[PDB]
Amino acid sequence: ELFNALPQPLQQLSLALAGEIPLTDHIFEQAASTWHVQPRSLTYKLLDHIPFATPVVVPPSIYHSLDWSKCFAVNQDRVERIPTIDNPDDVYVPNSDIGPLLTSLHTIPDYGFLHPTIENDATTLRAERARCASTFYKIASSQARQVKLDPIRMLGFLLLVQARPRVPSGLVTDQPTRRDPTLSPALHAIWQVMQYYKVAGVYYAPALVVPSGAIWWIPPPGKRNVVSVQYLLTDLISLAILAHMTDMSPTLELTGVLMYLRAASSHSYAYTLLQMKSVFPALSLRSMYRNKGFGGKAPAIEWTEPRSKYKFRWTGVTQLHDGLRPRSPSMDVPTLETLAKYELVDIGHTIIRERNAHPQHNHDSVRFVRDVMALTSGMYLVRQPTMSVLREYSQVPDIKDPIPPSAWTGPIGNVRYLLPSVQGPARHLYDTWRAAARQIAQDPQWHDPLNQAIMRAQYVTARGGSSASLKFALKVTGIVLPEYDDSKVKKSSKIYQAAQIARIAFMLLIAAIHAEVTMGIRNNVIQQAISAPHTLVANYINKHMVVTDKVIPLILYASTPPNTVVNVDIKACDASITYNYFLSVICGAMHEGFEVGNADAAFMGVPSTIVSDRRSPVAPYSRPISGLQTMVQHLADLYAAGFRYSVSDAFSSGNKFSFPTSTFPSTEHTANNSTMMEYFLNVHAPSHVKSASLKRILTDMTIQRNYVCQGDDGILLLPHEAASKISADDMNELLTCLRDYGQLFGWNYDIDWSDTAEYLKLYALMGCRIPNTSRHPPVGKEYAAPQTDEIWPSLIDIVIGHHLNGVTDVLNWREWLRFSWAFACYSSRGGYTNPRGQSFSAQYPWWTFVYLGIPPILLPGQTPFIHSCYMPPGDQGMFSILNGWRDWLISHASTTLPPLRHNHPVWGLSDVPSLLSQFGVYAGYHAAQHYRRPKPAPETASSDSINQITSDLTEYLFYDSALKARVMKGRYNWERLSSSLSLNVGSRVPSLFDVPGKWVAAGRDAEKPPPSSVEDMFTSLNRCIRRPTHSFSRLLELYLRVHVALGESIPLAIDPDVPQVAGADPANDDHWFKYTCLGDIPSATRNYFGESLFVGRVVSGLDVEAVDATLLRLKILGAPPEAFIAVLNGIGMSDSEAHQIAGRISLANAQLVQIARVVHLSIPSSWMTLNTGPYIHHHAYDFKPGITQPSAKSRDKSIWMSPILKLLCTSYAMTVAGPVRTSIVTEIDGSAAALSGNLRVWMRD
């Protein structure tokens, strides 16, 4: 059997994780070091223990391999472009073996790496062959790197979860699992593949994974190590996991496997999958319910006031019928024919046979749609960077109606105006952009110095950026010499550094007109600042424009079978904006709108030059243009020469380039979406659609209503003459007049109408959101780099991003929670070996994952699986566990450990901090608060870290216009106030002196932190484990006074048999409860949620919720009005603008969540997709005057006190794993005015 085949430590853990033994730190530690010590290939032996009955037979043609030498030609001078076999797009990877080009690594024999000799040739002398070999090894060991860890390890956790059956929890609606590991086609095809890699009884994995990349095993003579098998195992593992967290039927699962075995067998594994990526949502999600007899329940959502403030409201239940079926035809004819060419038709007829057995909209039907959509291979697809640029970036759009050259005026310097005669879609684009440019040019908003410092903060990216080259190898065109390091400089050309390099003349200088030399360097801060009036106008078109309340509510309303919905996705909206049509009308219109401004007004540091103006043939005359028009003359000299790309990929060896194209990797190809559809519904489609009925429908349709634009995506929802839509006459003739409308100016519209709704990759069928589990797979994670970046505790943040991202999805939790726990444990045994010294290690105890968000399986006093996966992370969850069993550990430590002599007011004389320290709670509490990334070493050239000149002069870019005085008035008037009078913080309130330090902390975050720093991380980590402070935190020790007891479940928010979310059916215990007790559509009252944050305009270096808390955190205390203006001057706001905020910030009319933010009680990301708005302020009492005690009566202080107490209640109410229920503060240990005073001691810090 599988269970008695495992190692002693693992058998105990599998038992422990399953629920039989609450796991202790000894169970956790021995199971952690059992993984890292034993060889990784040994967990493939466990496949040989389970018997198998699935009829999946792998072909012997998997291991055949067309060699890489035919499929990796250096067509250009140093470009390893793969010569496609049969296509332009067959370039993902070749299904070759790396048999010859491997030399055995001496540490792990029979596991080789790139040949030492071959690598040298590529670096020194190109070997059309000696570099084509190197670009094949660094792709196949990078395509086998798109994975969270070793996938052989991720399979090893699934055998732990399937080692034992789960202990029955005791809940009524707890279904034991139906999945049998002896009946699974995924991990039977793994073992059938793994027979080929067998040298005398032992298994060799074909590619052990190292943070530099994969290490491929060297086959003995006669066998081939084909690179596709490692990806064929990475998908088959990811199917073996997604069919044990989904309860996928064995027959349905079998079809998915045959999809993979055909793909490994053909020439390219990666390529085959891509051509059949949409072959599985089309069979099921797109085509559900077309048979007669359709009819279940579906929600009845309303659009309240449609024009703006999309505020959908869940109002009722519809009863479906044979009418309002999906009018669109099924995808069986089209996808199956496409499917037919790869010889899997039989896997198409199986899924069609299953789908015809779900005729009506049930829980079982919409669970089936998630089962088929979890069959698409969610692995990422690495392609050579040089090769990728050729096939993606450079595709010039085809225009079926160009602007004639006699439709422009004469030139005015560089740009041209459009003539008034030429109507069409070009005229509406010109008129909607010129009218918006003549609103921006007459505006007081962008002349304020704080708005300038915000705009300079958007250019140096606080998040993102790319590998820009430099500036002074591009300023040899100019005369301006750039700044150099005063002291040793660490940051290399960081977007921030570019600002640092030239900050002498407001981050730009009309002496710096050499911004057009080498742009967009990616595999510029002065081109982002030349493009100021291009995204200033695009942020006026995008006035009407989050996912949780502006998309999730929508997708649902659009999917209901009243209104039929066309979803419009534009393919390559980047590569459709060209200067031949789109970007010349834009720069033409902005230069026309920018004349209603004062024609001598400089903008953003660019003066007001003159221009030729030759647009009249009888009188050309020099004309002074404005400052904003001067940027347009340099935008038109930049957009017309395209964008340079200095792509130099590290995958291919010598591949360096200089690439010009017309694609930008900001919000304009978002902004052009609405105005080009506004012309469709009003002018173009009523002009010709050849249908009397069709024309009638369009006339009553606008674009503010009936269209929701975002990015390149968008949903077009028709007027209410809806379900009654003739698909032959109306909805297909509306589509061909749409798809030919976009082709007359290059926009390749890709319409795919069906009665689901796709909106930025969140599908929903019939009022029920369907999560795509292959969008973020369990084993898969992109990296997009040769060498990765994994020190050691950067695996823990992956695990919490692996667990919580699977629970936004309605993945079954019990199979999932156990899997997450097993995976979490592996991520607790780490190490670091010095290059010239001793090796090191660390051991995170469990309870360091309970503090991070993973709920525990079995505490020592309970029954397993009663802590829900919606438990909030941190102190809200550490309270909501300790509030659960405080009646247990007090009774247990009264009959074990001796009583303490003094009294802890939360407990009694029963001594539980010496019991909590025995269970390892404090060692888990102080471990996760300890930092995880290695600190950049504190090394400078001079002044003991002071007088740094790259940090002190990034402030010069942020201090233009005597704003510098306001942040100096802020840090003076606050330090005069706080450190001597009262409210003495000791640390800085979030002022503007932190963010030039924050650009360096996000800039000096260099790779390879030296061995001096990561050893210092390992030593500091080991001290906070061995001597974790016995005392808890200062917030948690005050939260534990509250005794929260919860009553019977609250009146429901959804008739709990309409299925709202992809399988949160009674197979799932709590996910069906928390999605029907609470509702979806998370729009609530304006006294709870309504997105205030009473500052709004942050400087982008500051957290918005750090200002919003500390503006409230003073108002809780006895703050003088001076302490509000001194903090708000620290952000840089003017004294007049700070005063209007200093009077506003009252607890009366303050969002309930904001008050909770003061003491760091946040609504977490786990239930952001839930309607916890009315739950907190209706139910979850802070005082129910008959159950509660009069001792816990927050009297006068209740305005700010109640929010905290209502969020401690709902933290306990979502942590337990049943229906949500009314949670009452029973009593507080010590009175509530003796706790409200206790928080105000902490709120002075």
Binding site: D443, Q445, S1136, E1137, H1139, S1146, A1148
Partner: protein
């Protein structure tokens, strides 16, 4: 020289209680905003008096106290006040009717008046009162209002 701290220090120093759920003082400050506006809209309403044959300054459609909101609503009460003070600064011929209309559509339950035409009622949004003929007769002659 505009200096809105003086309006701020004259409003925020009215002693309200921190036990009601709605602070009137907080609400007025809320709507009045410090959005970075350097108050050029006062000088775009002064300079639009030399060109009132050309450009006429209409009150903005978003800034009216909206319907489905009685006079009890304190954000919809201050918006009716700020419309009245900034009435004649606009060079719009129908502004006076609009300012009057905002309040008459704000309390159209206790005080019914007579709107002069069919096609619109008292609870019509006040922005539509832009023709000269649809001025209510009670407003043209206050003796008709009892």
């Amino acid at each position: 020289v505009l200096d809105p701290t003086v309006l701020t220090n004259a409003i925020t120093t009215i002693s309200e209680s921190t036990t009601q759920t709605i602070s009137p003082i907080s609400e007025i400050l809320r709507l009045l905003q410090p959005m970075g506006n350097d108050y050029a809209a006062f000088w775009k309403c002064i300079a639009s008096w030399a060109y009132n044959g050309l450009v006429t300054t209409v009150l903005s459609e978003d800034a009216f106290p909206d319907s489905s909101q009685s006079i009890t609503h304190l954000p919809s009460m201050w918006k009716c006040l700020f419309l009245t003070l900034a009435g004649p600064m606009t060079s719009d011929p129908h502004s006076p009717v609009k300012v009057f209309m905002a309040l008459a559509n704000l309390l159209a339950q206790p005080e019914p008046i007579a709107i002069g035409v069919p096609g619109m009622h008292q609870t019509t949004p006040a922005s539509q009162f832009s023709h000269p003929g649809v001025w209510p007769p009670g407003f043209l002659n206050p003796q008709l209002i009892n």
